[PDB]
């Protein structure tokens, strides 16, 4: 969509029990839809008051730790669960496996609007930080950095630079700040061209199979592993329609009766974990919302990446 007028940096945010179950096919880091919905919840809660439009999100993930455990004698992993309460008779309830993970991410969220000129930059930065302190990011509480050495503050970098050199200079200053992490971007063109080459190899190939080929460490005979460009992962890239769009007060047991509902299903794209100084433009690497509601296809990606 539209380009950001400024680039706010929420600092290293600790999330204690995020949803490690991203999707029915992927586990690990939470879905980027969690971060885009979080930024839209931030806009819904302070962006209408500071007259700004917080839009887009850059995911950095300084550290990650899934609450998993590899069982004895297996190559796979399982999830450490919680003990839910008993039922009304004292019987143990049926265990529903939820993944939990401890994250330390920082969010490069793009901000544009008329509120940039009305308030100081540090003022709106402190406002959205004090709002995000009372929120949750993927089902996990945001730990607010109390009584450590020093709180990591904000810096709203203005994307409009007086030069190209000043723009690259404070961009390099920001990239040094979010440097111990690993930026997550949407790489769907590489998945599409990998589909084309794999279809050239053997026809009627799905890009589900191209995704699966880009995930696995496949071996080749002369033995040599297939090289992979970068840290290629599968991500859930939004939802696809399974149902016609129902009326607000038509579907039974919705969340609300003023919003149209539609039964949907995940869409598994591809993402790439790269170091944040590779991109040379932090105006990119932001995850936006692309609905196109008449067709379905509610999805998120990083447009203007390459």
């Amino acid at each position: 969509v539209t380009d950001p007028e400024a680039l706010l940096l929420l600092p290293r945010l600790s999330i204690q029990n995020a949803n490690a179950i991203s999707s029915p096919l992927t586990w690990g880091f939470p879905s980027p839809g969690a971060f885009t919905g979080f930024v839209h919840a931030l806009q819904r809660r302070v962006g209408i008051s500071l007259d700004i439009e917080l839009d887009g999100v850059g995911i950095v993930c300084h550290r990650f730790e899934a609450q998993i455990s590899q069982p004895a004698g297996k190559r796979t992993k399982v999830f450490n669960l919680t003990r839910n309460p008993l039922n009304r008779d004292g019987s143990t309830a049926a265990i529903v496996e939820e993944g939990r993970a401890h994250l330390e991410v920082s969010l490069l969220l793009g901000v544009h609007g008329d509120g940039l000129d009305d308030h100081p930059a540090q003022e709106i930065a402190r406002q959205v930080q004090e709002q995000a302190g009372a929120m949750r990011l993927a089902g996990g509480s945001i730990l607010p950095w109390c009584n450590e050495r020093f709180p990591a503050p904000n810096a709203e970098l203005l994307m409009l630079g007086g030069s190209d050199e000043q723009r690259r200079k404070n961009q390099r200053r920001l990239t040094r700040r979010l440097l111990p992490g690993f930026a997550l971007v949407s790489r769907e063109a590489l998945l599409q061209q990998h589909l084309e080459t794999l279809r050239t190899t053997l026809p009627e190939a799905t890009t589900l199979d191209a995704l699966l080929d880009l995930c696995r460490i496949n071996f080749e005979p002369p033995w040599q592993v297939r090289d992979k460009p970068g840290w290629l992962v599968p991500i859930p890239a939004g939802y696809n329609a399974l149902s016609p769009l129902y009326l607000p007060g038509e579907v039974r047991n919705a969340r609300d009766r003023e919003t149209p509902l539609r039964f949907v299903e995940n869409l598994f794209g591809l993402g790439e974990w790269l170091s944040p100084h590779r991109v040379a433009a932090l105006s990119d690497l932001l995850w936006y919302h692309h609905a196109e509601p008449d067709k379905g296809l509610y999805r998120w990606s990083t447009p203007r990446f390459v």
Binding site: P71, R88, R136, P144, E258
Partner: protein, 335 residues
């Protein structure tokens, strides 16, 4: 007619973090920011059979053949160092606020009726009985679950954290504040007004809770234990796994939350237990028995329906319990 909403969901207010445990010596507790962490390590246990036998394993030949084959595990154990007698358990707690507003509600008529009922309660009697009990469960170190039962002296330090620095510091003797009497004190009531202003306001109030306990040199501490199904197949594995965030033993946040919610002294069965955790159909996991059964009119759901739908306001203790469930959270709703 004002029927019950089909999707009800309240977010968890009183959100704690994972209680990191570290260890050092008492009477240098004020320099306890570089105390080394209590680490979870492995040890082999070997036991004889001590369970009850099922009356077909009571043949003395079968018993003597059984006790010649012991049963070997490798448990996780967390001990203090041999030159450190104090366990420092340190977690943070966000008191969020907006305690009555549901995160999801279907019927807007039911939503406004619930907001009117909650505001009727708050304007009538604010969060002053509830936050007093939450300040008690922060004050006595009940979140020290088994690390409290044999301690010589437990001291809890609670620091209100403003934008980057401490705004107000408390200090309690957690053994004097009992585990069953919600009495009155000046500092406890100051903490109660702080948690009340947290739960009533729009923004969050953040507290840092530190608890020290003199256990003894090298004694065993009890971090949270992990619930893992599928322990493994056809090998030897661990029977007991302890929680540890980053090579540092820890209590789960939901165990700290269950300790903080242990305020319910109003369940109709006698208080041989004392306070229990605030839950709909209030069910103690260790007891295995669910008090506040729906057979009596004293669980959460029927009290909420009588309070909101047909305006049958219950006793002040029971509506304390109902608003304590609303602070607790939950996912409610029928088909």
């Amino acid at each position: 007619i004002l029927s019950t909403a089909s999707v009800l969901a309240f977010e968890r207010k009183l959100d704690p973090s994972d209680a990191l445990m570290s260890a050092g010596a008492w009477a240098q507790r004020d320099a306890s920011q570089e105390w080394p962490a209590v680490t979870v390590r492995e040890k082999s246990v070997r036991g004889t059979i001590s369970n009850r036998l099922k009356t077909k394993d009571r043949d003395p030949a079968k018993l003597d053949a059984s006790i010649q084959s012991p049963n070997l595990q490798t448990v996780d154990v967390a001990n203090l160092p041999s030159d450190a007698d104090t366990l420092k358990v340190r977690f943070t707690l966000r008191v969020l606020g907006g305690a009555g507003t549901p995160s999801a509600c279907n019927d807007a008529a039911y939503r406004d009726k619930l907001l009117q009922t909650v505001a009727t309660y708050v304007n009538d009697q604010g969060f002053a009985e509830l936050a007093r009990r939450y300040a008690h469960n922060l004050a006595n170190a009940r979140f020290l679950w088994r690390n409290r039962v044999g301690a010589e002296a437990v001291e809890v330090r609670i620091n209100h954290i403003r934008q980057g620095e401490v705004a107000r510091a408390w200090r309690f003797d957690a053994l004097a504040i009992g585990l069953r009497d919600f009495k009155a004190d000046a500092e406890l009531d100051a903490l109660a007004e702080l948690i009340a202003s947290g739960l009533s306001g729009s923004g969050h109030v953040l507290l840092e809770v530190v608890a020290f306990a003199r256990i003894g040199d090298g004694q065993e501490v009890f971090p949270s234990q992990e619930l893992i199904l599928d322990k493994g197949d056809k090998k030897g594995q661990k029977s007991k796994t302890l929680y540890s965030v980053r090579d540092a033993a820890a209590i789960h946040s939901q165990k700290i939350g269950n300790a903080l919610r242990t305020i319910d002294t109003w369940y109709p069965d006698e208080d041989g237990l004392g306070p229990i955790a605030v839950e709909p159909y209030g069910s103690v996991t260790s007891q295995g028995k669910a008090y506040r059964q729906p057979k009596q009119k004293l669980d959460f759901y029927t009290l909420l329906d009588n309070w909101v739908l047909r305006d049958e306001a219950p006793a002040v203790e029971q509506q304390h319990y109902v608003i304590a469930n609303l602070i607790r959270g939950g996912v409610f709703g029928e088909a």
